[PDB]
């Protein structure tokens, strides 16, 4: 290696944060978003109503939590689906949120809790 080491990257997070959700013939707690251009999505990310991620100063606009890893350059998810899917209604999720820079986690959690989403405190 030029620097003495090479790193091929870590495995993307797997969709296992869901501990409980409302089962229904059609997904009652799941919603579909049109993927925004040139945006990379990963499990545990917070999205606004329009499908864009939540940045600092707008935590009150948090709408849903992403569930599928989406590759922008392919315009296709890792499961071959055309759309992004996120949780937007009552459910229990592992406390493994991924947030942008300078985003206050507490505000996001309070905003989401109003929709019935609770976070189980994960161990180590």
């Amino acid at each position: 290696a030029y620097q003495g080491f090479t790193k091929l990257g870590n495995r993307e997070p797997l969709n296992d944060i869901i501990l409980w959700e409302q089962i229904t013939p059609t997904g009652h707690s799941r919603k579909e978003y049109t993927p925004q251009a040139s945006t990379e999505y990963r499990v545990g990310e917070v999205l606004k109503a329009d499908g864009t991620k939540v940045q600092a100063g707008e935590e009150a606009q948090a709408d849903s939590v992403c569930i599928v890893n989406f590759y922008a350059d392919l315009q296709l998810s890792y499961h071959g689906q055309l759309k992004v899917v996120g949780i937007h209604r009552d459910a229990e999720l592992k406390d493994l949120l991924t947030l942008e820079a300078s985003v206050d986690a507490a505000a996001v959690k309070t905003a989401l809790a109003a929709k019935g989403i609770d976070f189980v405190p994960t161990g180590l």
Binding site: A1, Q3, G4, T6, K7, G9, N10, T122, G123
Partner: protein
Amino acid sequence: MLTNSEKSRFFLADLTGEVQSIPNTYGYISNLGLFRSAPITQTTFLMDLTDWDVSLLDAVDRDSRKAETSAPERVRQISFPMMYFKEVESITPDEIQGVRQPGTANELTTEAVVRAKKLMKIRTKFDITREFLFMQALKGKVVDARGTLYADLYKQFDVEKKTVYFDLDNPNADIDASIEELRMHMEDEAKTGTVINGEEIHVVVDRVFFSKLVKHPKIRDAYLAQQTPLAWQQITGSLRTGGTDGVQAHMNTFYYGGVKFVQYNGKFKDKRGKVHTLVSIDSVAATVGVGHAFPNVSMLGEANNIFEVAYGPCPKMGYANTLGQELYVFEYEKDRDEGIDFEAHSYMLPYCTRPQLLVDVRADAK
């Protein structure tokens, strides 16, 4: 056999032969057998790393019916390059036209003798390079004698390095404390998932460190006050009871606290002219004692070998995807019977899979 006299061509004197001086070679590590041979058919290789951890559990109220959960594991991947070595040599008729053999009177040199000598020199050079590379790998960073950096294990695997200070200069300093620190580090930082005995380790040190350790008052008095063969042998016997390196028939050895200390004098010269001591530590004055510690093979068994060597294929035709060999030697004939030219090739990289188990030892204190 008779030759011309010193100051007259008409008188003869008797020649009694030759005496040869051969440079020293050491090759100590190469004989321990620590490094296994792992030939491969490619110019690179990969590895997978898996990690997980656990923590204590917090009490919750019975009626609330709340609970806890554990985070998932982390998987990662890495890669390695490899080092290539090559050298050339040739034989021409001018080397055998009228050139007397050193040990005789009127016998001429022949192609066979030059061939054998040059091949032996090539093999010696490659052995020296292999020993140097093994020692560099054991230090934790693989760098060519030219100074190029090829592998940095402490960065390839995200981990740091530990140094242990003995403070042998202080008359009141305790050594058992440092030995226990080393043992606990080796026992705790493995994270192999099984029971580990840290008593199984090699400790190779230099001359100054060995002398300071042996002559410390606390060790000397303690071993002097005991009536047992080990005490007698070390205090007033000969400490040279170890194995053989490439030069001397026994290596200085010392026993204390269940640890075995060995003195290694190996050193080589770069073609730039400088001297590369094998046991030294980078950027530390040679006046300070220095050593290196690493686990034994039995500390984990062959099922979990830690040291390996990889061998790649030769660039020439007919070896596109072969398994690879330690050394290749080829010969070709020059144009219109002008001479012979040789070539020797090598392609290897030694590495370690758990670099955090390599600990450096120092005689000073900080």
